[PDB]
Structure 1
């Protein structure tokens, strides 16, 4: 019993965090095998950030202009290249703590754990969702760039996010580990702003299934809905469209609980209309959208 925002155990990632310095700029890098990955803006001054030409900034650098520290130990850089918005530093030592890993690009609505780091030293771990507007609602201060997001499956770490910047609303933007930004954002100080965000409907439905599994049914009703009528209503509350794919993904939870997906949809419609009337669902007074169907299954009793 209980239901918590739970992160993956972070130890496999902790052993990969290093500090990268170029000039007066320090941030975090990810040391896997003999490569360190970090945001390419490490090669920029503050002045450079308005209109950087990364090709021109990088060609002026030699390997020894990059200082990489792994705990107490300096790693020697013996090569560098840029891939999209990520700098890849070849080092002369393979990380002996490299876990089984892959690089994955996630889609909006997917969750991951973030290891927030400063000066190559891990500070804290929390769970995030990729918002529909391609931002994350993290907790990051100056010095956090190059902190990573990940999932773990068996003993395999799937890296999906690297932190690059803060937007004016206090949310965060970054790239996959191939250096491609999530969303329309750029590693340039421009007037970019987060789009108006929306609620991740499939996740809210998963979390309502979690509430049922943990023994709460107060919010159900005697109605059903068509998928189209559900979407017409939900969109009036700035909820994401629910697709047939989402309905399919919810099948196992439907089966475990005996509540048809469109019957849970009718429940959600009524919750948006009514509020909670002084009640809570899994300890929350609002509808939670940062647990995926997978996350509910992961955490909840299968009974």
Structure 2
């Protein structure tokens, strides 16, 4: 197909990555104005990591225990606090590369760009989606803790994810920039399982709209459905139910193609019930669920 996982240009975020070290424990942090944000796990020694008491651990730290570096350049820490699972270190220098920014908490299905970093040095950028079980299928090595995920709209970086940990199945878990985990996970080095995942229905529908835009439309039928009936069927096939917000974000694709959202729902319901019977959509037998309606419009229309 002519669709790629495309990331946002990463330069605005690259200019904000720093390294934070407490003793020998080291990870990545995010320097915006005169504050550095990073996972509070940095304050753990190896022996603390299993079952940390973060209040007690933080109480015994002072500003002079935190080594924050921009490249090789040390930034002096002049205050510290903890908000949920994020440490906030106030530094004596406002980052001159700070972009316009927001902190946002995203829903499952939403996509974002990840800047994978090691020792405060950006290494790679890629797009990924928040799964319905609140994990991401990222690509992260040891030392990636504190890498961030983001979108860029207008000229403003919306930070939505800070990476904390790998789960036993190789998927990834983390927090928003206010330190609240996505999903039921905790920041301790214990085995935590993600729940069973489901397919992101709103994104599958966006993919079907993308196929229509490109002239691949064999799956359009003469039926419609109600949203409630569709949701009840979807859940029988391990598909997420649609929300009212999902119907709304499909609006532009519906308008562009002239296909009502609930008619697309009826078409997807036929595919769930009957399978693709050997046919392909956009050259594939698999339905893509990590392109949002906004991703589709970006790549089709710019």
TM-score normalised by L of structure 2: 0.95
More displaced stretch, 226-235 vs 256-265:
226-235
Cα separation, 2, equivalents of 1:203 and 1:239: 11
Question: What are the Cα deviations for residues 133-181 of structure 1, in whole angstroms up to 9, with x where unaligned?
Answer: 1111111111000000001011100101100111111111111111111
- How far has the Cα of 1:272 moved from its partner? 2.3
Cα separation, 2, equivalents of 1:117 and 1:231: 39
- How far has the Cα of 1:182 moved from its partner? 1.0
Cα separation, 1, equivalents of 2:236 and 2:198: 11
More displaced stretch, 219-228 vs 125-134:
219-228
Structure 1 equivalent of residue 46 of structure 2: 46
SS of the residue aligned with 2:98?
A: coil
More displaced stretch, 231-240 vs 173-182:
231-240
- How far has the Cα of 1:228 moved from its partner? 3.0
CA pair 299-47 structure 1, distance change in 2 beyond 3 A: same
Task: Tell me if the contact between 2:115 and 2:124 (Cα under 8 Å) persists in the aligned partners.
Answer: yes
Question: What are the Cα deviations for residues 249-298 of structure 1, in whole angstroms up to 9, with x where unaligned?
Answer: 22221111011112211221222234444544334431111111222222
- How far has the Cα of 1:79 moved from its partner? 1.5
Structure 1 equivalent of residue 231 of structure 2: 231
Task: Tell me if the contact between 2:176 and 2:182 (Cα under 8 Å) persists in the aligned partners.
Answer: yes
- How far has the Cα of 1:14 moved from its partner? 0.4
Cα separation, 2, equivalents of 1:56 and 1:274: 57
CA pair 137-177 structure 1, distance change in 2 beyond 3 A: same
More displaced stretch, 70-79 vs 173-182:
70-79
Structure 2 equivalent of residue 100 of structure 1: 100
Task: Tell me if the contact between 1:110 and 1:292 (Cα under 8 Å) persists in the aligned partners.
Answer: yes
SS of the residue aligned with 1:48?
A: coil
- Matching of residue 209 in structure 1 with residue 209 in structure 2: yes
- How far has the Cα of 1:243 moved from its partner? 2.9
Question: What are the Cα deviations for residues 13-50 of structure 1, in whole angstroms up to 9, with x where unaligned?
Answer: 00000111111111100011111110000011232122
- How far has the Cα of 1:64 moved from its partner? 2.2
Cα separation, 1, equivalents of 2:155 and 2:248: 28
Where in structure 1 do 4 or more consecutive aligned residues deviate above 6 Å? none
More displaced stretch, 282-291 vs 249-258:
282-291
Structure 1 gap ranges (5+) = none
Cα separation, 2, equivalents of 1:227 and 1:83: 39
Task: Tell me if the contact between 2:167 and 2:191 (Cα under 8 Å) persists in the aligned partners.
Answer: no
TM-score normalised by L of structure 1: 0.94
- How far has the Cα of 1:215 moved from its partner? 2.1
Question: What are the Cα deviations for residues 76-123 of structure 1, in whole angstroms up to 9, with x where unaligned?
Answer: 112211111111111111111111111111122211111011111111
The Cα RMSD (Å) is 1.7
SS of the residue aligned with 2:218?
A: coil
Count of aligned positions: 302
